[PDB]
């Protein structure tokens, strides 16, 4: 049944053809249970083992290495019996890495808390219904409830389904709907219809929602919807956002593999075209059946050369290091690839209650009468400090401490607040903090009484647990509450009838203490207290009282105001019909006005500053709350989102106002407006979606289950440490200390981490460019293998792996947080940097091939044809007497390759220092800036010589020690790489853009 809230009780009963006195018959239940299903939220799954594994091998790059490793495995078996003992090294090293980087990928995904599981914790196991079977209520399984049955809820129950209220048995029904609105203030329900078909949850005061709980009262209703069709069901469906979207950096890495997989094949085509005269001459060695082993050889070397095999490892290591750094700042990260994204954040959406605020009602202002003289009426106003339920804070007057006890009026004020109260304070020794017991707006009064300590009761020695209600207990020892005239909607006030508990206060006699909506209470007052005296209520006194109350309730204050009063001469206990609330207004007449208290859910201390720091970094902050527009806007001004007098006509909307706008306007409002109130959970995700529609990196901060959808939809969901489990499980980060400042620190961390990643990524990929150039030269020029896949993997995994990791340790800039968010589509390298790295690559591709060709010609260890006939080295065994005159196994010597590898390694160790800064010379920024980089290079060279000396290695790597003359050659062709890059920088740092 849709729109049950807009229908009358009769119509809802008629809709299901059920009687409120009997309920559904077993046949109806069976029927409805077949049509509507069971009243439960469906669990989730899909993490199929034979699926999450296939995903690890879904990347275009990992597939190329998968194929390559296989092709390399076939060439290992179909290998000569020369030394096929260590030929499968390469095929296994690759397969090892793949299954390694793949098994880890399943680890981060298998280990994931389900937000749905946490949400289902709000679904009660049992429910109470009235069926045709019995006349007495039946306590059955909540999941067995169905649309149409008559349900009963009472204090403490967790609402079992979305229900249309039929009849309230208590004076009022109090409901805590915080899971849908984020507010803990209990809402007063009624049974009248709510006309508006587009009404929001907070407007549906005649409905009870599944997952919510009853704070007080008892009522009967009819189930309208169950399962996924409920409000918490909408939250659940939204949480089912399985479609995983990749971050900007991840997107940049995917396009890289795209073009890479193209260039690879493109080069493979070039090679198959450069060798035109291959099968043109009578060749018998190159079998058409078995001869393509030449291409399946280079095809492998090419892939291994282009793919930065070690990149995915250095990224995770860098992110892991960053994650620990943030945890140090009380920022627990649940998603590693989030650290980077947070730094790209341009818009931070934020919940208010419990996130921006403490979610702890606090009385911050109060007043009593000061003087009365005809038309003149002055007041004694005080402010109160503290933003929590803890009895910590002072009462000030003119920003100066005072003793509440000194003012008689305050003594009565406190007495009313202590007695006309149904809540209390409790110290949670486990969590080490004071918590409320009962309603928030009532506990604020309790807490208030503890701060005022009107009787100057000694509380220093007392402990936490004892301090919690020390002053309130003092007043209860003086005046006893005999009974309560519970609050009722028709009167909007409540009172307690009390009498002295000691003959020492006999003069007070019977008194009724009243509190409530100001207007009604004040109208029922005929007197006003002035100290311990009392004078009549006059027009001037009344207007003075109301005028101040009006200011407190709608300006920079916008406080929730309560008027406090006491009937000095109440009726006889026997003249009061206590079971008929409709009589209570009359008993609360002829009152004496005592004072007013003003309270609010206060912003956290570090929020205002945090907002400003965000703004400096070009980061906008938008409030999205389930609370009302008025207080939402007031808080925006308090924390700086809006200026003190800024016009907010079109910069603030309620959920209903927002939906009223056309889809087009809705989209733009999200860019201009900074405040959305009276919102439903779907509104928050909707606005986040709109922001993202403009390709903005948006974050969401929240604490309630009503923030879940939005926390999920956002690129970075940030949850409060003291928030709900649902919010935490749906977020990428958790602020363990609920300190908003941590968000700014996390953003900075994210920008600093990215700048370094942007470096070692360029360093690594730059290296792969040279490696591919080499393979291309030593293939087109028909020269002998200068480098083999086994050699390349070691370079891209260890040799450069360490230096890359060390680059992630570069010191961050100073103006990092003083600059605007970087565009998400910003390319890691293009323009001048493209050409700049286009050259460095060409160089490396020549320094390696040349270092190999050098040994085969001008070296003093194996001279060759100084006429480049080294190209036809292949035709040495076929026609030896041609132009040889030496062993043919010379074109496989370890000397030439070792020469090339030492050039590559040395060039990279030097190109690492070139990576310490983009456009800054190593002189303007010395290498010793990053002690880790230096220590990194040393660990690399040592591991390099390790492969040239430890006998069991040179064999598998096909390498061989070098002379002091050999090495000199390397340092002569590598070292100049620093000069080249140092020059390219100048070309831009002093011309292009510098």
What is the binding site for Na ion (CB under 5 A)?
Answer: 712, 714, 717
218 annotated to a ligand binding site: no
768 annotated to a ligand binding site: yes
Integer Cα distance of 938 and 957 in angstroms? 21
For residue 935, state whether it binds ligand TG1 (rule: CB under 6 A): no
φ, ψ dihedrals at 701, nearest 5°: -115, 135
For residue 678, state whether it binds ligand ADP (rule: CB under 6 A): no
Residue with tokens 């209390």: 424
Which segments of 721-783 are extended strands (E)? 733-735
Other beta carbons within 10 Å of 886: 12
Specify the stretch interacting with ligand ADP by CB under 6 A; choose among 489-497, 502-510, 589-597, 857-865: 489-497
| Pairing state between β 560-567 and 591-600 | antiparallel
Integer Cα distance of 560 and 441 in angstroms? 9
Give the per-residue contact string, 495-534, with ligand ADP (x = CB under 6 A; - = no).
--------------------xxx-----------------
| Contact partner, 704, from Mg ion, Na ion, ligand ADP, none, Cβ < 5-8 Å per class | Mg ion
Residues in the chain: 994
Give the per-residue contact string, 314-353, with Mg ion (x = CB under 5 A; - = no).
-------------------------------------x-x
Is 425 within 8 Å of 431 (Cβ atoms)? Answer: no
Over the range 781-818, which residues count as b (16 or more CB within 10 Å of their CB) and which as e?
Answer: eebbbbbbbbbbbbbbbbbbbbbbbbbbebeeeeebbe
| Contact partner, 351, from Na ion, ligand ADP, Mg ion, none, Cβ < 5-8 Å per class | Mg ion
Torsion, Cα 288 290 292 298, to 10 degrees, reads -160
Structure tokens at 208: 């009870």
Q: How many helices (H) does the chain have, and how many strands (E)?
A: 35, 30
Residues 253-292 that bind ligand TG1 (CB under 6 A): 253, 255-256, 259-260, 263, 267
Cα separation of the two ends of the chain: 68
For residue 703, state whether it binds Mg ion (rule: CB under 5 A): yes
248 or 750: whose CB is closer to ligand TG1?
A: 248
Which segments of 703-825 are extended strands (E)? 716-720, 733-735
Is 519 within 8 Å of 539 (Cβ atoms)? Answer: no
Q: Between vectors from CA 114 to CA 113 and to CA 117, what angle results, nearest 5°?
A: 125
Integer Cα distance of 130 and 799 in angstroms? 75
515 annotated to a ligand binding site: yes
117 annotated to a ligand binding site: no
| Contact partner, 182, from Mg ion, ligand ADP, Na ion, none, Cβ < 5-8 Å per class | Mg ion
Integer Cα distance of 677 and 682 in angstroms? 13
For residue 773, state whether it binds ligand TG1 (rule: CB under 6 A): yes
For residue 585, state whether it binds ligand ADP (rule: CB under 6 A): no
Residue with tokens 């407007």: 203
Nearest of 528, 523, 444, 536 to residue 491 by alpha carbon: 523
For residue 934, state whether it binds ligand TG1 (rule: CB under 6 A): no
Q: In whole angstroms, how far apart are CA 837 and each of 763, 796, 940?
A: 9, 17, 23
Q: Which of 157, 162, 176, 351 is catalytic?
A: 351
- The residues pairing with 680 across neighbouring beta strands, listed in sequence order, are none
| Contact partner, 353, from Mg ion, ligand TG1, Na ion, none, Cβ < 5-8 Å per class | Mg ion
For residue 494, state whether it binds ligand ADP (rule: CB under 6 A): yes
| Pairing state between β 698-702 and 716-720 | parallel
Nearest of 286, 149, 140 to residue 225 by alpha carbon: 149
Residue 44 burial by Cβ neighbours in a 10 Å radius (0-12, 13-18, 19+): middle
Residues 840-899 that bind ligand TG1 (CB under 6 A): 841
CB of 119 to Na ion, least distance (A): 15
How many residues contact ligand ADP, by CB under 6 A?
9
For residue 487, state whether it binds ligand ADP (rule: CB under 6 A): yes
Residues 346-405 that bind Mg ion (CB under 5 A): 351, 353-354
Structure tokens at 802: 């360490």
Specify the stretch interacting with ligand TG1 by CB under 6 A; choose among 458-466, 768-776, 904-912, 951-959: 768-776
Other beta carbons within 10 Å of 339: 29
Q: Does 879 qualify as catalytic in the annotation? A: no
Specify the stretch interacting with ligand TG1 by CB under 6 A; choose among 48-56, 85-93, 210-218, 825-833: 825-833
Q: In whole angstroms, how far apart are CA 680 and each of 228, 322, 544, 700, 702?
A: 16, 35, 39, 15, 14
150 or 705: whose CB is closer to Mg ion?
A: 705
365 or 712: whose CB is closer to Na ion?
A: 712
> What is the gyration radius of the CA atoms in the chain, in angstroms?
39
Name the residue whose CB lies closest to ligand ADP. 188
Give the per-residue contact string, 183-222, with ligand ADP (x = CB under 6 A; - = no).
-----x----------------------------------
Residues 240-259 that bind ligand TG1 (CB under 6 A): 252-253, 255-256, 259
58 or 647: whose CB is closer to ligand TG1?
A: 58
Specify the stretch interacting with ligand TG1 by CB under 6 A; choose among 81-89, 197-205, 786-794, 830-838: 830-838
Specify the stretch interacting with ligand TG1 by CB under 6 A; choose among 446-454, 516-524, 832-840, 897-905: 832-840
For residue 838, state whether it binds ligand TG1 (rule: CB under 6 A): yes
CB of 843 to ligand TG1, least distance (A): 12
125 annotated to a ligand binding site: no
φ, ψ dihedrals at 331, nearest 5°: -115, 100
| Contact partner, 354, from Mg ion, ligand TG1, Na ion, none, Cβ < 5-8 Å per class | Mg ion
Integer Cα distance of 676 and 682 in angstroms? 12
For residue 772, state whether it binds ligand TG1 (rule: CB under 6 A): yes
Integer Cα distance of 881 and 876 in angstroms? 8
CB of 490 to ligand ADP, least distance (A): 10
CB of 631 to Na ion, least distance (A): 28
Q: Which residues are annotated as a binding site for Mg(2+)?
A: 351, 353, 703
Active-site amino acid positions: 351
Q: Which residues are annotated as a binding site for Ca(2+)?
A: 304-305, 307, 309, 768, 771, 796, 799-800, 908
Q: Which residues are annotated as a binding site for ATP?
A: 353, 442, 489, 515, 560, 625-627, 678, 684, 706
Please give the residue ranges that form the binding site for ligand TG1 (CB under 6 A): 252-253, 255-256, 259-260, 263, 267, 306, 761, 765, 768-769, 772-773, 776, 827-829, 834, 837-838, 841
Please give the residue ranges that form the binding site for Mg ion (CB under 5 A): 182, 351, 353-354, 703-704
């Amino acid at each position: 049944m849709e729109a049950a809230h807009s229908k009358s009780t009769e119509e809802c009963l008629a809709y299901f053809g059920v009687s409120e006195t009997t309920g559904l018959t077993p046949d109806q239940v069976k029927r409805h249970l077949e049509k509507y299903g069971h009243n439960e939220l469906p669990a989730e799954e899909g993490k199929s083992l034979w699926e999450l594994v296939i995903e690890q091998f879904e990347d275009l790059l990992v597939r190329i290495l998968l194929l390559a490793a296989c092709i390399s495995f076939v060439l290992a078996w179909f290998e000569e019996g020369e030394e096929t003992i260590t030929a499968f090294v390469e095929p296994f090293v690759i397969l090892l890495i793949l299954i390694a980087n793949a098994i880890v990928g399943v680890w981060q995904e298998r280990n994931a808390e389900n937000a749905i599981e946490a949400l289902k914790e709000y679904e009660p196991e049992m429910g109470k219904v009235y069926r045709a079977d019995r006349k007495s209520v039946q306590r059955i399984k909540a999941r067995d409830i169905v649309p149409g049955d008559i349900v009963e809820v009472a204090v403490g129950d967790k609402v079992p389904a979305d229900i249309r209220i039929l009849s309230i048995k208590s004076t009022t029904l109090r409901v805590d709907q915080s899971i849908l609105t984020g507010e803990s203030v209990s809402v007063i329900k009624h049974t009248e219809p709510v006309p508006d078909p587009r009404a929001v949850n907070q407007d549906k005061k005649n409905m009870l929602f599944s997952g919510t709980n009853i704070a007080a009262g008892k009522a009967l209703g009819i189930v309208a919807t169950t399962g996924v069709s409920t409000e918490i069901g909408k939250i659940r469906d939204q949480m089912a956002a399985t479609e995983q979207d990749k971050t900007p950096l991840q997107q940049k890495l995917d396009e890289f593999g795209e073009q890479l997989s193209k260039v690879i094949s493109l080069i493979c085509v070039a090679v198959w075209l450069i060798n035109i005269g291959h099968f043109n001459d009578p060749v018998h060695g190159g079998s058409w059946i078995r001869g393509a082993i030449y291409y399946f050889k280079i095809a492998v070397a090419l892939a291994v050369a282009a793919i930065p095999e070690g990149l995915p490892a250095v990224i995770t290591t860098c992110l892991a290091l960053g994650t620990r750094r943030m945890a140090k700042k009380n920022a627990i990260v649940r998603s590693l690839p989030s650290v980077e994204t947070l730094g790209c954040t341009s818009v931070i959406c934020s919940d208010k209650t419990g996130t921006l605020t403490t979610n702890q009602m606090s009385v911050c202002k109060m007043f009593i009468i000061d003087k009365v003289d005809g038309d003149f009426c002055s007041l004694n106003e005080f402010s109160i400090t503290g933003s929590t339920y803890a009895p910590e804070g002072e009462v000030l007057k003119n920003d100066k401490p005072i003793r509440s006890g000194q003012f008689d009026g305050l003594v009565e004020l406190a007495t009313i607040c202590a007695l006309c109260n149904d809540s209390s304070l409790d110290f949670n020794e486990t969590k080490g903090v004071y918590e409320k017991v009962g309603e928030a707006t009532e506990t604020a009064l309790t807490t208030l009484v503890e701060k005022m300590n009107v009787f100057n009761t000694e509380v220093r020695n007392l402990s936490k647990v004892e301090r919690a209600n020390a002053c309130n207990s003092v007043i209860r020892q003086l005046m006893k509450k005999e009974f309560t005239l519970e609050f009722s909607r028709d009167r909007k006030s409540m009172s307690v009838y009390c009498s002295p508990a000691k003959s020492s206060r006999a003069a007070v006699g019977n008194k009724m203490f009243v509190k409530g909506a100001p207007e009604g209470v004040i109208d029922r007052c005929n007197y006003v207290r002035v100290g311990t005296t009392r004078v009549p209520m006059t027009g001037p006194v009344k207007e003075k009282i109301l005028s101040v109350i009006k200011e407190w309730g709608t300006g920079r204050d916008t406080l929730r105001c309560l008027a406090l009063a006491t009937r000095d001469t109440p009726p006889k206990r026997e003249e009061m019909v206590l079971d008929d609330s409709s009589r209570f207004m009359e008993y609360e007449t002829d009152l004496t006005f005592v004072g007013v208290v003003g309270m609010l859910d206060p912003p956290r201390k570090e929020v205002m500053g945090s907002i400003q720091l965000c703004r400096d970094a070009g980061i906008r902050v938008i409030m999205i709350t389930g609370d009302n527009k008025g207080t939402a806007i007031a808080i925006c001004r308090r924390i700086g989102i809006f200026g003190e007098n800024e016009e907010v006509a079109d910069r603030a909307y309620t959920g209903r106002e927002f939906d009223d706008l056309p889809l087009a306007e809705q989209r733009e409002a999200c860019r201009r407006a900074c405040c959305f109130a009276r919102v439903e959970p779907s509104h928050k995700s909707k606005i986040v979606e709109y922001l993202q529609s403009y390709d903005e990196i948006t974050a969401m901060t929240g604490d309630g289950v009503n923030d879940a959808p939005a926390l999920k939809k956002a690129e970075i969901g940030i949850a409060m440490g003291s928030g709900t489990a649902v919010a935490k499980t749906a977020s990428e980060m958790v602020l363990a200390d609920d300190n908003f400042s941590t968000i700014v620190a996390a953003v900075e961390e994210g920008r600093a981490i990215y700048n370094n990643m942007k470096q070692f990524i360029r360093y690594l990929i730059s290296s792969n460019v040279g490696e591919v150039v080499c393979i291309f030269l030593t293939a087109a020029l028909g020269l002998p293998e200068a480098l083999i896949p086994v050699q390349l993997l070691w370079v891209n995994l260890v040799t450069d792996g360490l230096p890359a990791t060390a680059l992630g340790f570069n010191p961050p800039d100073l103006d990092i947080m003083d600059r605007p968010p970087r565009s998400p589509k910003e390319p890691l390298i293009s323009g001048w940097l493209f050409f700049r790295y286009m050259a460095i690559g060409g160089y490396v591709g020549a320094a390696t091939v040349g270092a190999a060709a050098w040994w085969f010609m001008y070296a003093e260890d194996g001279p060759g044809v100084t006429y480049h006939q080294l190209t036809h080295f292949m035709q040495c065994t076929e026609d030896h007497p041609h132009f040889e005159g030496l062993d043919c196994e010379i074109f496989e010597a370890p000397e030439p390759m070792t020469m090339a590898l030492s050039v590559l390694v040395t060039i990279e160790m030097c190109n690492a220092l070139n990576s310490l800064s983009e456009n800054q010379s190593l002189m303007r920024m010395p290498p010793w800036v990053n002690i880790w980089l230096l220590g990194s290079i040393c660990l690399s060279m040592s591991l390099h010589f390790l492969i040239l000396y430890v006998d069991p290695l040179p064999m598998i790597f096909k390498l061989k020690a070098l002379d002091l003359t050999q090495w000199l050659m390397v340092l002569k062709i590598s070292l100049p790489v620093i000069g080249l890059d140092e020059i390219l920088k100048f070309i831009a740092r002093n011309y292009l853009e510098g």
